[PDB]
Amino acid sequence: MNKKSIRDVDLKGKRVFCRVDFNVPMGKITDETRIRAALPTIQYLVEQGAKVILASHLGRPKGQAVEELRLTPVAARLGELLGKDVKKADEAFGPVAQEMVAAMNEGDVLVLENVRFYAGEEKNDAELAKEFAALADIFVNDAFGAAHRAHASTAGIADYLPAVSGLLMEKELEVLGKALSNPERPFAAIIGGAKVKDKIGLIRHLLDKVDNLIIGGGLAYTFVKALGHEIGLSLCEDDKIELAKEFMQLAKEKGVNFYMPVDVVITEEFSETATTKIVGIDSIPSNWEGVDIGPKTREIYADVIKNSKLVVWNGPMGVFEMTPFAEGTKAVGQALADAEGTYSVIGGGDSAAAVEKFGMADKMSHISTGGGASLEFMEGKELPGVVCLNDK
Numbered sequence: 001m002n003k004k005s006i007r008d009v010d011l012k013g014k015r016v017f018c019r020v021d022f023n024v025p026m027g028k029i030t031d032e033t034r035i036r037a038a039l040p041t042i043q044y045l046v047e048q049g050a051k052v053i054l055a056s057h058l059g060r061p062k063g064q065a066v067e068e069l070r071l072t073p074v075a076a077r078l079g080e081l082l083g084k085d086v087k088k089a090d091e092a093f094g095p096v097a098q099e100m101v102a103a104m105n106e107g108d109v110l111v112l113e114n115v116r117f118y119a120g121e122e123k124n125d126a127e128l129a130k131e132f133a134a135l136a137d138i139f140v141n142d143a144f145g146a147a148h149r150a151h152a153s154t155a156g157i158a159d160y161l162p163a164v165s166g167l168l169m170e171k172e173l174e175v176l177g178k179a180l181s182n183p184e185r186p187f188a189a190i191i192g193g194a195k196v197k198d199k200i201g202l203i204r205h206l207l208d209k210v211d212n213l214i215i216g217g218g219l220a221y222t223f224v225k226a227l228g229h230e231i232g233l234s235l236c237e238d239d240k241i242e243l244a245k246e247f248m249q250l251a252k253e254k255g256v257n258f259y260m261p262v263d264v265v266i267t268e269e270f271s272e273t274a275t276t277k278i279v280g281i282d283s284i285p286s287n288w289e290g291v292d293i294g295p296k297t298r299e300i301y302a303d304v305i306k307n308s309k310l311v312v313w314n315g316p317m318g319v320f321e322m323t324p325f326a327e328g329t330k331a332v333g334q335a336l337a338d339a340e341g342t343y344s345v346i347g348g349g350d351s352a353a354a355v356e357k358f359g360m361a362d363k364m365s366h367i368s369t370g371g372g373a374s375l376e377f378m379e380g381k382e383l384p385g386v387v388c389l390n391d392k
């Protein structure tokens with residue numbers, strides 16, 4: 001894969017429909033980072049003298065104009081950050097959007113209304129896609145995190161216009177694309193979180209790619225059970241036991257080094273003030289539950305991370321917002337930070353939340369903001385908002 005970006009096209013004077021992620025948590029805006037993330041792209045376009053027309057979702061209006069999910073305050077904040085009079089349209093298509101576009105000069109920025117106000121957005125209605133296209137000369141997709149769904153502003157519009165990546169999307173495709181096609185090696189994936197179900201596709205696909213597979217989080221206790229170890233009260237998806245067995249068999253047959261917990265932090269009651277102890281993985285008491293990877297396992301996982309040249313991390317080692325269950329996730333973050341020979345890729349939202357929380361985000365090589373998109377990409381899916389981009 002090799003997609004054109006805004007670096008590869010003549011933009012001066014062009015109306016650019018630029019799909020961004022301004023889905024900020026809200027009364028007023030309470031986290032700004034998504035708007036900041038978008039700045040290099042917007043600025044690059046402004047410097048080239050493009051007419052920058054920004055489209056984003058915000059919250060869940062489910063196909064009608066809800067008044068508290070308008071993009072008006074996001075446009076106000078963007079204006080502050082750019083030091084520019086950013087204009088904002090209360091419709092994202094039709095005559096009002098059209099006229100505000102007609103009124104633009106080169107280097108102007110116009111934020112269109114929340115694309116999710118319109119039922120046809122989620123349905124990828126062709127007529128709405130054509131209406132969005134009527135506003136522009138070129139489609140720039142800078143919202144990797146929205147690109148896994150076929151929506152009018154993420155994919156449909158590319159039926160009518162040329163289509164290229166923005167700066168965030170370009171980097172996401174460079175890093176994740178290389179990880180699937182020609183990773184540095186050894187290549188480890190760390191797969192965690194609470195549920196096997198959520199990570200089935202990723203486990204399956206990355207067992208064809210990695211040298212090392214490391215599991216943790218509540219997901220791992222299904223694997224522990226599948227080996228015939230006792231798991232007490234730990235989370236287990238009984239209908240995924242046989243899948244887990246087959247995954248371990250695939251790893252063995254392929255010579256993938258398969259790392260699961262060798263020791264576990266256990267408790268009788270999940271809570272922020274929980275009483276815990278550490279036990280070996282074949283010694284989980286019948287009335288306790290596994291809640292984190294133990295220190296022996298943290299040491300092993302750190303060694304594997306330090307000896308892997310590419311590590312993709314999707315999912316924590318425990319419910320790390322709970323103080324007593326955070327150390328395994330902290331240790332994995334620290335090992336990635338400490339590993340001077342390792343390209344660290346944070347592949348999902350909860351792993352991203354963890355590295356921000358524990359202070360090492362700055363030291364990660366790439367933190368994906370694709371969310372459900374980054375997972376789908378790493379499962380080897382064709383993302384509608386990526387496929388539609390024009391080939392270099």
Ligand SMILES: [Cl-]
Nearest residue numbers: 179183184310
């Ligand atoms: Cl790589």
Ligand SMILES: [Cl-]
Nearest residue numbers: 204243246247
């Ligand atoms: Cl399978």
Ligand SMILES: [Cl-]
Nearest residue numbers: 193194217218
């Ligand atoms: Cl978990």
Ligand SMILES: [Cl-]
Nearest residue numbers: 253254255256
């Ligand atoms: Cl093989």
Ligand SMILES: [Cl-]
Nearest residue numbers: 315348350351
């Ligand atoms: Cl994650």
Ligand SMILES: [Mg+2]
Nearest residue numbers: 337339340363
């Ligand atoms: Mg480093």
